[PDB]
């Protein structure tokens, strides 16, 4: 059982050591499309690339590239698109991907500015009456409503395909209180946030995969998907303690590199799953 494994690693202070064995065992697949010269300004970080096998393709004939990965968890029947925070020049691509994949939710785990630098473009409207048009991808986005809480904001958005005049409602879940350094002290507000996303229907199989991002789409984004998948597997299995968080992480790392960036994120993921298991048993 993970709770005992937790106390063992904690007591022994072996978090950096567990984390290194995960790094060592992690999959390495080609990422040739990401590294083409024409895609250099579509990537926020030169060392964070989607694998060719799992990358999301835009349906535009010119250049189909976006820094985004499909993570397919077969046993849990959950899919996620993990992506970087969009760049000034990829905001239109981001919304095209949301449209093309039939996503119902966007989960944002960073602030636009952290540590005095921009981590992400302002890719949604700030006021009802000031909508955004993306000329490159022929989409219009309107803020319908905004519910600001202590730890997170939920926004209702309308996305319109200007080409066909179809509209969809998108939910934007913005976790606003992840600290600039390290991880939250308690997983309570993170779990509350994750149950809010679940309750919305955004993670359900009747929609396209949820789009999850932080700045790189690997650290905080990683923790989100890992916690959701582990809790779902504990509901589904005859024996809940058969769920090994290290094995789940390694399976997720076949689809996108670097998921969980620090030993502290790993520790936090264990704590989130262990605490969430109480609200599920
Ligand atoms: C020494 S350790 O690897 O067990 N250790 C745990 C501690 O909480 C600090 C610093 C370091 C790794 C991450 C961070 O959580």
For the chain, give the secondary structure using H, E and C.
Answer: CHHHHHHHHHHHCCHHHHHHHHHHHCCCCCCHHHHCHHHHHHCCCCCCCCCHHHEEECCCCCCCEEEEEEEEECCCCEEEEEECCCCCCCHHHHHHHHHHHCECEEEECCCCEECCEECCCCCCCCCCCCCEEECCCCEEEEEEEEEECCCEEEEEEEEEECCCCCEEEEEEEEECCCCCCCCCCCCHHHHHHHHHHHHCCCCCCCCECEEEECCCCCCHHHHHHHHHHHHHHHHHCCCHHHCCHHHHHHHHCCCCCCCCCCHHHHHHHHHHHHHHHHCCC
**Closest atom of ligand 1 to CA, residue 267:** 15
261 is in an annotated binding site: yes
31 is in an annotated binding site: no
Distance CA 279, CA 240 (A): 14
User: Please, which residues bridge with residue 161 across strands?
Assistant: 139
The residue whose CA is least distant from atom 9 of ligand 1 is 264
Distance CA 198, CA 224 (A): 12
**Closest atom of ligand 1 to CA, residue 17:** 3
Q: Which residues are catalytic?
A: 214
Site of tokens 């059982």: 1
Distance CA 112, CA 108 (A): 10
Helix (H, G, I), strand (E, B) or coil at 13: coil
Cα 21 to ligand 1 centre (Å): 15
User: Please, which residues bridge with residue 175 across strands?
Assistant: 152
Distance CA 38, CA 176 (A): 34
Distance CA 212, CA 206 (A): 18
Distance CA 156, CA 143 (A): 6
Cα 23 to ligand 1 centre (Å): 16
Residue 149 DSSP symbol: -
The residue whose CA is least distant from atom 13 of ligand 1 is 264
Cβ-count burial of 238 within 10 angstroms (0-12 exposed, 13-18 middle, 19+ buried)?
A: exposed
Distance CA 59, CA 55 (A): 13
Distance CA 182, CA 48 (A): 20
Cα 182 to ligand 1 centre (Å): 11
Report CA Rg, the chain. 19
Distances (CA, A) of 64 to 59, 96, 106, 171, 281: 6, 11, 21, 25, 44
218 is in an annotated binding site: yes
**What's the maximum distance between 2 C-alpha atoms anywhere in the chain?**
60
Distance CA 231, CA 211 (A): 19
What is the experimental method? X-ray
219 is in an annotated binding site: yes
Domain boundaries, the chain: 1-281
Distance CA 92, CA 76 (A): 31
Distance CA 222, CA 19 (A): 14
Helix (H, G, I), strand (E, B) or coil at 246: helix
Distance CA 247, CA 266 (A): 13
The residue whose CA is least distant from atom 15 of ligand 1 is 264
Site of tokens 């502290």: 264
Tokens of 132: 């955004």
Q: Is the CB of 16 under 6 A from ligand 1?
A: yes
Pairing of strands 113-114, 105-108: unpaired
Strand ranges (E), the chain: 55-57, 65-73, 78-83, 105-108, 113-114, 117-118, 132-134, 139-148, 152-161, 167-175, 210-213
Cβ 184 vs Cβ 190: under 8 Å: yes
Pairing of strands 152-161, 167-175: antiparallel
100 φ, ψ (degrees, to nearest 5): -65, -35
146 φ, ψ (degrees, to nearest 5): -150, 120
- Measured from the Cβ of residue 69, the count of other Cβ atoms closer than 10 Å reads 25
């Amino acid at each position: 059982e993970m709770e005992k494994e937790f106390e063992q690693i904690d007591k022994s202070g072996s978090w950096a050591a567990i984390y290194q064995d995960i790094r060592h065992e992690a999959s390495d697949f080609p990422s040739r499309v990401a590294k083409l010269p024409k895609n250099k300004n579509r990537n926020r970080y030169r060392d964070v690339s989607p694998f060719d096998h799992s990358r999301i393709k835009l349906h535009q004939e010119d250049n189909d590239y976006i820094n985004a990965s499909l993570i397919k968890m077969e046993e849990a029947q959950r899919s996620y698109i993990l992506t970087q925070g969009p760049l000034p020049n990829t905001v239109g691509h981001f919304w095209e991907m949301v449209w093309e994949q039939k996503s119902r939710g966007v989960v944002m785990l960073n602030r636009v500015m952290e540590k005095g630098s921009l981590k992400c473009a302002q890719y949604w409207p700030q006021k009802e009456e000031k909508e955004m048009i993306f000329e490159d991808t022929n989409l219009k986005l309107t803020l319908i409503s905004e519910d600001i809480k202590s730890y997170y904001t939920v926004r209702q958005l309308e996305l319109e395909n200007l080409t066909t005049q179809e509209t969809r409602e998108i939910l934007h879940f913005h976790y606003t209180t992840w600290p600039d350094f390290g991880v939250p002290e308690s997983p309570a507000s993170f779990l509350n946030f994750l149950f809010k996303v679940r309750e919305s229907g955004s993670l359900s199989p009747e929609h396209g995969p949820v789009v999850v991002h932080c700045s790189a789409g690997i650290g905080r984004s990683g923790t989100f998907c890992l916690a959701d998948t582990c809790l779902l597997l504990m509901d589904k299995r005859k024996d809940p303690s058969s769920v090994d968080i290290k094995k789940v992480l390694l399976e997720m790392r076949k689809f996108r590199m670097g998921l969980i960036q620090t030993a502290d994120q790993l520790r936090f993921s264990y704590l989130a799953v262990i605490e969430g298991a109480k609200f599920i048993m």
